[PDB]
Design a protein around this ligand. Structure first.
Ligand SMILES: CCC[C@H](O)[C@H](NC[C@@H]1Cc2cccc(c2)CCCCc2cc(cc(N(CCC)S(C)(=O)=O)c2)C(=O)N1)C(=O)NCC(C)C
Length: 373
C-alpha cells in the first residue's frame, strides 16, 4: 500500500509540490500544496483569476460551518477565509476519510500563483502555529486521531519545468532511498525546528558561532523554494561561493536571486561551484551527522541555453531548509519520535565527480549551545 503513494506529488519549479485530495460529499477534487512550514488546511472557496476550480461548500452535504473567521500570513502570500469542517480523503494516500478543519479562502493576496495547478494548502506542522490559535486541530493530527495511520510521514521531493515526488503517509518506503537514515531531534513542536551545529563549504568550516546558524530558529519547510540563511550566515556563504567560482563573473543581482545566469546548453561549469555541508544535531550525546548538497540543488533551473537562479537567499527569521535542500533526500518527519530523518534519495542528482550525501557519525562538542534562546 505504500507503493500506491509513490509518485503522488507534482509541481512547477519554484511553486511548491502538491498532492491530490478530495473534500466534501460528493467528493470534490482539488490539488493541495504540501507545506511543512505551516499548520492550516485551506482551500480556494470562491472565484479567483488563477484558480481553475474551488471548494463549493453549498454542494457538500457534509459541510459544517464553524462561524469563525481566519487569516494566515506567509513569508510569501496571505489569505483570509471562513472556518468549517468537512470529510477529506487523499486518493493516492491511505484508504481513509476524516473530518477535518478546513479554511475556505474568500480573499487572498499574492498567494495563488498564475498557472500553478494547485488550489489549496496542506499545513503539516503543529497546532502551536495554527491560526487563529492552537485549538484549531491541524489535518495530520485529525488523521492520526480518527484512524490507525501511524504518526509519521515522509517526503521525497525530486527536482527537474515540472517536478514530482512522493509523500508517504503513515510510514517509510524503503525502496525510495539508499544507505542509512540519519535522524536529528525536533527541537520543539511548532515548526519542524532543528539545530544546525556546523557548516562547511568545499570542506572548509565557515567557523561562525553555531548560534548564528539557528539565529532565531532553523526549520524544515517544504513550502519554501530556497535555502534561506540569516543575514550574517548568508553573507559568509556568498563570499565563500563567490570566491570558489571567481573564475567567472556574475552580476551582483544574480547573488540576490534577481537575475538569471545562462551558459551554452550542456556547458554549465558545475565544478566551480562548491558543495555545502550542513551538520545537524544527532540522536546521541556529542554526535552529529552531515548532509551535503551540490550546486545542482542550489542553482535552480529556469527558462538553447541552460539558465539558473541562485536559490540561496537571505532571511531575517532564521534558517529555512526549503525544497532545494530537501530535493535528492528522503526526509522522514517522525512525529511519533520527535525526530526528522534524512537519507540519500533514489531520485538523486548526478554529477560525474561529486555526490550528494548523508554521512555520520561525527563528534561535535557542546551542541546545545547552538540553539538560540
Ligand atoms: C519562519 C518561516 C515560515 C515559513 O516561511 C513558512 N513558509 C511556508 C509557505 C507556504 C506557501 C505559501 C504560498 C505559496 C507557496 C507556499 C508555493 C511556493 C512559492 C515560493 C515560496 C514560498 C515561501 C517562501 C519563499 N521564499 C521566501 C519569500 C519570498 S524563497 C526564499 O524565495 O524560497 C518562496 C513560503 O513562505 N511558503 C510560512 O510562511 N509559515 C507561515 C505560518 C506559520 C504563519
Amino acid at each position: 500500500s505504500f507503493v500506491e503513494m509513490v509518485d503522488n506529488l507534482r509541481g512547477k519549479s519554484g511553486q511548491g509540490y502538491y498532492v491530490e485530495m478530495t473534500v466534501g460529499s460528493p467528493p470534490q477534487t482539488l490539488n493541495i500544496l504540501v507545506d511543512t512550514g505551516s499548520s492550516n488546511f485551506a482551500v480556494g472557496a470562491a472565484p479567483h483569476p488563477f484558480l481553475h476550480r474551488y471548494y463549493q461548500r453549498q454542494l457538500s452535504s457534509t459541510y459544517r460551518d464553524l462561524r469563525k473567521g481566519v487569516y494566515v500570513p506567509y513569508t510569501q502570500g496571505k489569505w483570509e477565509g471562513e472556518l468549517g469542517t468537512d470529510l477529506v480523503s487523499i486518493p493516492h494516500g491511505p484508504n481513509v476519510t476524516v473530518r477535518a478543519n478546513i479554511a475556505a479562502i474568500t480573499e487572498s493576496d499574492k498567494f495563488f500563483i498564475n498557472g500553478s495547478n494547485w488550489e489549496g494548502i496542506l499545513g503539516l506542522a503543529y497546532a502551536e502555529i495554527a491560526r487563529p490559535d492552537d485549538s484549531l486541530e491541524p489535518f495530520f493530527d485529525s488523521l492520526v486521531k480518527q484512524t490507525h495511520v501511524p504518526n509519521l510521514f515522509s517526503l521525497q521531493l525530486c527536482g527537474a519545468a515540472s517536478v514530482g515526488g512522493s509523500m508517504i503517509i503513515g510510514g517509510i518506503d524503503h525502496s525510495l532511498y539508499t544507505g542509512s537514515l540519519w535522524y536529528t531531534p525536533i527541537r520543539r513542536e511548532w515548526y519542524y525546528e532543528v539545530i544546525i551545529v556546523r557548516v562547511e563549504i568545499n570542506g572548509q568550516d565557515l567557523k561562525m558561532d553555531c548560534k548564528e546558524y539557528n539565529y532565531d530558529k532553523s526549520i524544515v519547510d517544504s513550502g519554501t523554494t530556497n535555502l534561506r540563511l540569516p543575514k550574517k550566515v548568508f553573507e559568509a556563504a556568498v563570499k565563500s561561493i563567490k570566491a570558489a567560482s571567481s573564475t567567472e563573473k556574475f552580476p551582483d543581482g544574480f547573488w540576490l536571486g534577481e537575475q538569471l545566469v545562462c551558459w551554452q546548453a550542456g556547458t554549465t561549469p558545475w565544478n566551480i561551484f562548491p558543495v555545502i555541508s550542513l551538520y545537524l544535531m544527532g540522536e546521541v550525546t556529542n554526535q552529529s551527522f552531515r548532509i551535503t548538497i551540490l550546486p545542482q540543488q542550489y542553482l535552480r533551473p529556469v527558462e538553447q541555453d541552460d539558465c539558473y537562479k541562485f536559490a540561496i537567499s537571505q532571511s531575517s527569521t532564521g534558517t529555512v531548509m526549503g525544497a532545494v535542500i530537501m530535493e535528492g533526500f528522503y526526509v522522514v518527519f517522525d512525529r511519533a519520535r520527535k525526530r526528522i530523518g534524512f537519507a540519500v534519495s533514489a531520485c538523486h542528482v548526478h554529477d560525474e565527480f561529486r555526490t550528494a550525501a548523508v554521512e555520520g557519525p561525527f563528534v561535535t562538542l557542546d551542541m546545545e549551545d547552538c540553539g538560540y534562546n
